[PDB]
Design an enzyme around this catalytic site. Sequence first.
Site, PDB file in Angstrom:
ATOM      1  N   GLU A  58       0.841  -1.194   0.000  1.00 36.60           N
ATOM      2  CA  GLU A  58       0.000   0.000   0.000  1.00 36.60           C
ATOM      3  C   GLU A  58       0.883   1.252   0.000  1.00 36.60           C
ATOM      4  O   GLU A  58       0.620   2.205  -0.732  1.00 36.60           O
ATOM      5  CB  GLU A  58      -0.921   0.034   1.224  1.00 36.60           C
ATOM      6  CG  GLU A  58      -1.827   1.268   1.247  1.00 36.60           C
ATOM      7  CD  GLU A  58      -2.541   1.478   2.568  1.00 36.60           C
ATOM      8  OE1 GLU A  58      -1.873   1.478   3.623  1.00 36.60           O
ATOM      9  OE2 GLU A  58      -3.777   1.663   2.556  1.00 36.60           O
ATOM     10  N   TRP A  80      -8.286  -2.399  -0.027  1.00 35.33           N
ATOM     11  CA  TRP A  80      -9.024  -1.295  -0.645  1.00 35.33           C
ATOM     12  C   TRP A  80     -10.161  -1.720  -1.567  1.00 35.33           C
ATOM     13  O   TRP A  80     -10.652  -0.923  -2.369  1.00 35.33           O
ATOM     14  CB  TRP A  80      -8.077  -0.378  -1.425  1.00 35.33           C
ATOM     15  CG  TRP A  80      -7.336   0.581  -0.556  1.00 35.33           C
ATOM     16  CD1 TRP A  80      -6.085   0.424  -0.032  1.00 35.33           C
ATOM     17  CD2 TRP A  80      -7.826   1.829  -0.057  1.00 35.33           C
ATOM     18  NE1 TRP A  80      -5.764   1.501   0.760  1.00 35.33           N
ATOM     19  CE2 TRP A  80      -6.812   2.383   0.755  1.00 35.33           C
ATOM     20  CE3 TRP A  80      -9.017   2.543  -0.233  1.00 35.33           C
ATOM     21  CZ2 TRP A  80      -6.963   3.607   1.412  1.00 35.33           C
ATOM     22  CZ3 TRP A  80      -9.167   3.759   0.418  1.00 35.33           C
ATOM     23  CH2 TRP A  80      -8.141   4.284   1.223  1.00 35.33           C
ATOM     24  N   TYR A  94      -4.984   9.434  -1.237  1.00 37.64           N
ATOM     25  CA  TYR A  94      -3.584   9.531  -0.813  1.00 37.64           C
ATOM     26  C   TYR A  94      -2.529   9.659  -1.906  1.00 37.64           C
ATOM     27  O   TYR A  94      -1.893  10.705  -2.037  1.00 37.64           O
ATOM     28  CB  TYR A  94      -3.228   8.343   0.081  1.00 37.64           C
ATOM     29  CG  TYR A  94      -4.146   8.186   1.266  1.00 37.64           C
ATOM     30  CD1 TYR A  94      -4.085   9.066   2.350  1.00 37.64           C
ATOM     31  CD2 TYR A  94      -5.091   7.165   1.301  1.00 37.64           C
ATOM     32  CE1 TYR A  94      -4.946   8.922   3.441  1.00 37.64           C
ATOM     33  CE2 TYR A  94      -5.950   7.016   2.381  1.00 37.64           C
ATOM     34  CZ  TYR A  94      -5.874   7.892   3.447  1.00 37.64           C
ATOM     35  OH  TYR A  94      -6.726   7.725   4.517  1.00 37.64           O
ATOM     36  N   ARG A 126      10.396  24.195   9.440  1.00 43.79           N
ATOM     37  CA  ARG A 126       9.270  23.838  10.285  1.00 43.79           C
ATOM     38  C   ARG A 126       8.049  23.630   9.402  1.00 43.79           C
ATOM     39  O   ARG A 126       6.924  23.518   9.893  1.00 43.79           O
ATOM     40  CB  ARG A 126       9.028  24.954  11.307  1.00 43.79           C
ATOM     41  CG  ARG A 126      10.228  25.157  12.224  1.00 43.79           C
ATOM     42  CD  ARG A 126      10.022  26.268  13.248  1.00 43.79           C
ATOM     43  NE  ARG A 126      10.001  27.587  12.625  1.00 43.79           N
ATOM     44  CZ  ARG A 126      10.612  28.658  13.120  1.00 43.79           C
ATOM     45  NH1 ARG A 126      11.299  28.575  14.256  1.00 43.79           N
ATOM     46  NH2 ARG A 126      10.549  29.813  12.472  1.00 43.79           N
ATOM     47  N   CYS A 146      -8.064   9.392   6.157  1.00 43.50           N
ATOM     48  CA  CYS A 146      -8.040   9.139   7.616  1.00 43.50           C
ATOM     49  C   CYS A 146      -6.704   9.650   8.164  1.00 43.50           C
ATOM     50  O   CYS A 146      -6.643  10.440   9.115  1.00 43.50           O
ATOM     51  CB  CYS A 146      -8.189   7.631   7.963  1.00 43.50           C
ATOM     52  SG  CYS A 146      -9.791   6.793   7.700  1.00 43.50           S
ATOM     53  N   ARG A 166      -7.286  12.024  11.607  1.00 43.99           N
ATOM     54  CA  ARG A 166      -8.567  12.605  12.007  1.00 43.99           C
ATOM     55  C   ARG A 166      -9.628  11.581  12.416  1.00 43.99           C
ATOM     56  O   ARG A 166     -10.533  11.888  13.199  1.00 43.99           O
ATOM     57  CB  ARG A 166      -9.080  13.527  10.891  1.00 43.99           C
ATOM     58  CG  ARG A 166      -9.273  12.859   9.547  1.00 43.99           C
ATOM     59  CD  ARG A 166     -10.684  12.369   9.402  1.00 43.99           C
ATOM     60  NE  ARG A 166     -10.881  11.588   8.189  1.00 43.99           N
ATOM     61  CZ  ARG A 166     -11.996  10.918   7.920  1.00 43.99           C
ATOM     62  NH1 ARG A 166     -13.006  10.950   8.779  1.00 43.99           N
ATOM     63  NH2 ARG A 166     -12.092  10.194   6.810  1.00 43.99           N
ATOM     64  N   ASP A 169      -9.837   3.782  13.339  1.00 41.69           N
ATOM     65  CA  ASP A 169     -10.437   2.509  13.711  1.00 41.69           C
ATOM     66  C   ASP A 169      -9.297   1.904  14.532  1.00 41.69           C
ATOM     67  O   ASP A 169      -8.342   1.370  13.965  1.00 41.69           O
ATOM     68  CB  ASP A 169     -10.681   1.664  12.456  1.00 41.69           C
ATOM     69  CG  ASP A 169     -11.228   0.291  12.769  1.00 41.69           C
ATOM     70  OD1 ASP A 169     -10.851  -0.287  13.810  1.00 41.69           O
ATOM     71  OD2 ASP A 169     -12.031  -0.221  11.959  1.00 41.69           O
ATOM     72  N   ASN A 177      -1.706   1.570  10.225  1.00 39.27           N
ATOM     73  CA  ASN A 177      -1.272   2.953  10.066  1.00 39.27           C
ATOM     74  C   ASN A 177       0.063   3.267  10.723  1.00 39.27           C
ATOM     75  O   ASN A 177       0.902   3.946  10.130  1.00 39.27           O
ATOM     76  CB  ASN A 177      -2.341   3.892  10.623  1.00 39.27           C
ATOM     77  CG  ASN A 177      -3.670   3.748   9.912  1.00 39.27           C
ATOM     78  OD1 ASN A 177      -4.720   4.064  10.471  1.00 39.27           O
ATOM     79  ND2 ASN A 177      -3.632   3.277   8.666  1.00 39.27           N
ATOM     80  N   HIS A 207     -11.701   5.720  17.770  1.00 40.05           N
ATOM     81  CA  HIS A 207     -12.760   4.813  18.182  1.00 40.05           C
ATOM     82  C   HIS A 207     -12.560   3.310  18.031  1.00 40.05           C
ATOM     83  O   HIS A 207     -11.689   2.837  17.304  1.00 40.05           O
ATOM     84  CB  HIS A 207     -14.011   5.186  17.399  1.00 40.05           C
ATOM     85  CG  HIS A 207     -13.769   5.281  15.925  1.00 40.05           C
ATOM     86  ND1 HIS A 207     -13.185   6.384  15.340  1.00 40.05           N
ATOM     87  CD2 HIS A 207     -13.944   4.377  14.931  1.00 40.05           C
ATOM     88  CE1 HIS A 207     -13.010   6.155  14.050  1.00 40.05           C
ATOM     89  NE2 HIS A 207     -13.461   4.945  13.777  1.00 40.05           N
ATOM     90  N   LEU A 208     -13.418   2.574  18.728  1.00 39.85           N
ATOM     91  CA  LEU A 208     -13.455   1.122  18.679  1.00 39.85           C
ATOM     92  C   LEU A 208     -14.862   0.792  18.187  1.00 39.85           C
ATOM     93  O   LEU A 208     -15.842   1.251  18.773  1.00 39.85           O
ATOM     94  CB  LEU A 208     -13.257   0.517  20.068  1.00 39.85           C
ATOM     95  CG  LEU A 208     -11.854   0.507  20.674  1.00 39.85           C
ATOM     96  CD1 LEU A 208     -11.907  -0.097  22.074  1.00 39.85           C
ATOM     97  CD2 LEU A 208     -10.924  -0.307  19.780  1.00 39.85           C
ATOM     98  N   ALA A 263     -15.718  -2.114   8.889  1.00 42.57           N
ATOM     99  CA  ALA A 263     -16.887  -1.262   8.689  1.00 42.57           C
ATOM    100  C   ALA A 263     -16.797  -0.543   7.348  1.00 42.57           C
ATOM    101  O   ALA A 263     -15.813   0.139   7.064  1.00 42.57           O
ATOM    102  CB  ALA A 263     -16.995  -0.248   9.821  1.00 42.57           C
TER     103      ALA A 263
END
Lengths: 264, 264
Positions: A58, A80, A94, A126, A146, A166, A169, A177, A207-208, A263
């Site tokens: 990926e 995907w 991406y 920076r 994500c 942002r 999962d 990730n 989240h879960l 999901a």
Amino acid sequence: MKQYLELMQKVLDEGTQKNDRTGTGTLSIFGHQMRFNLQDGFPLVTTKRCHLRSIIHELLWFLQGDTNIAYLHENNVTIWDEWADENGDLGPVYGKQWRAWPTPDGRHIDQITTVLNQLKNDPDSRRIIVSAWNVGELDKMALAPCHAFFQFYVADGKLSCQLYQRSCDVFLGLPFNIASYALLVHMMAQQCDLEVGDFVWTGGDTHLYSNHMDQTHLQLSREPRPLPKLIIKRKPESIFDYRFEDFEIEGYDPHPGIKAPVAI
Amino acid sequence: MKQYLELMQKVLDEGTQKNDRTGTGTLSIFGHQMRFNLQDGFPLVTTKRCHLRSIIHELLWFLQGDTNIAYLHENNVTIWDEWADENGDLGPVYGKQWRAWPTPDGRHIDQITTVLNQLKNDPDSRRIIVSAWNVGELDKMALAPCHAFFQFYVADGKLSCQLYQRSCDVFLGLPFNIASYALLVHMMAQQCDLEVGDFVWTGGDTHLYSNHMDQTHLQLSREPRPLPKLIIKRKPESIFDYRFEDFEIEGYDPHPGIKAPVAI
Ligand SMILES: Nc1nc2c(c(=O)[nH]1)N[C@@H](CNc1ccc(C(=O)N[C@@H](CCC(=O)O)C(=O)O)cc1)CN2
Ligand SMILES: Nc1nc2c(c(=O)[nH]1)N[C@@H](CNc1ccc(C(=O)N[C@@H](CCC(=O)O)C(=O)O)cc1)CN2
Ligand SMILES: *c1cc(=O)[nH]c(=O)n1[C@H]1C[C@H](O)[C@@H](COP(=O)(O)O)O1
Ligand SMILES: *c1cc(=O)[nH]c(=O)n1[C@H]1C[C@H](O)[C@@H](COP(=O)(O)O)O1
């Protein structure tokens, strides 16, 4: 990993019930941060077997600026599938934004090339950033980014990177990730003759999924193990010339993989 | 504030010396996160007197989508003088990106109105985001966006917001930036009949300029006082109709102001 498991537990203890676009439901918290010193080991979760083959392809896929899952299928990567269309397209996700962010005037900007040149010529900058959050093209993407924005930093000859995710999962996506970006850091560092620093992970809606609770409890009952070591067997002439065979993980002996429904 | 002072101390304790674009030199860390529960009080630094007048006007200015300092000058705000051209223009910075992000097909997206609509119709959305990081227009800007990306979140009737600040002048800029976004959260909450949640601040290159050290230690020698209280006296027809006079800060009893030179 310690920090991963503490986050998993925090979501269980502090998360509030949410009704996401899917209607699956989740336990969620907002705002969390973790730091992984890459010199302590490659941050590949050990409390469940995570397959790097998909993670590696990926990433190489992203770097080529490709958004068609054809390449992934050619290497049997199906992560995907649930979002691609009839022709295998995902829209300007991406890969496209990383390599060819379209400007208002019809041209494109190569953020990866910019970053490499920044790291080599202006390491103290920076502004060493890559953003996939192209507001003007969100409506064309199969799904909104994500892992949305990331920044590099150089100090004491070490390369660090911070990712702003942002939406996360925690069970299915996060392990993937973290490894993906840790890998990118190792690659960038190699091309810039730098040592690896920290990978800082920052989350927004973390989240879960409700249907991942059994798997979460199972994973939390497992003790983490020493992190593996990433070995890059070949130094390509550019960050865009890596191949699957170049990567090898050493000393990775994780707990058995855990199966869980994604999901859509 | 406790969180702010602890960050200063963190930069001092773990920071690395680094050169920078302004040629001033800094002490910096990479990656940090802190939270301010807005119901505890308005997060306006008390260990030094902070100029709320400029903070409010800058935010109203951003919300109008303005990028010329004329409006700031009409209200005696000089914080952007150092970077404006001879006509007072800064290029498509914050305000322009917030209200009219240009897409590649000629459209413009009002991210502020978009977020308000999402909060009203889909508060559990995990993509309630505003980005000032428009890759295609960065080099048209006088300066690249410091507070570059922010996300909103709603739980238990409370509105929260997380900002990713890619570059942070801890002594001069941070106090302003924290109050600015806290103010924005209050405004959005009022427009949406929501209570205020937390303002989560996340930083990338978080630094203290070499010429801010004595001022920083002077401030650290002081004990934070009770947080002031923010009172909004009116509910305008829209988030774009607020006026300076609609805001009143109560119980602000700061320690003496501490002057310091801005890095250009
Ligand atoms: N909701 C959800 N949607 C997503 C992602 C996510 O993060 N979660 N991420 C992107 C797709 N990435 C993934 C990554 C992992 C998996 C996944 O299902 N992993 C399994 C299976 C691994 C395998 O295929 O061998 C695991 O056990 O790790 C699904 C989508 C886009 N959509
Ligand atoms: N390097 C630096 N440059 C910057 C910013 C920063 O963050 N630091 N931020 C933007 C400009 N914003 C500010 C905010 C505050 C000040 C400043 O100078 N504040 C003084 C004076 C305020 C006043 O005018 O009363 C104080 O005492 O708080 C300077 C630039 C863009 N450039
Ligand atoms: C998105 C892709 C990724 O690489 N990592 C992730 O964690 N995810 C997860 C987050 C969320 O569960 C789902 C995206 O849904 P939404 O766009 O936030 O509504 O994929
Ligand atoms: C930028 C604007 C702001 O509202 N807050 C900030 O802290 N600043 C600071 C960060 C940095 O010291 C300087 C911008 O310089 P660079 O683009 O990071 O080189 O202003």
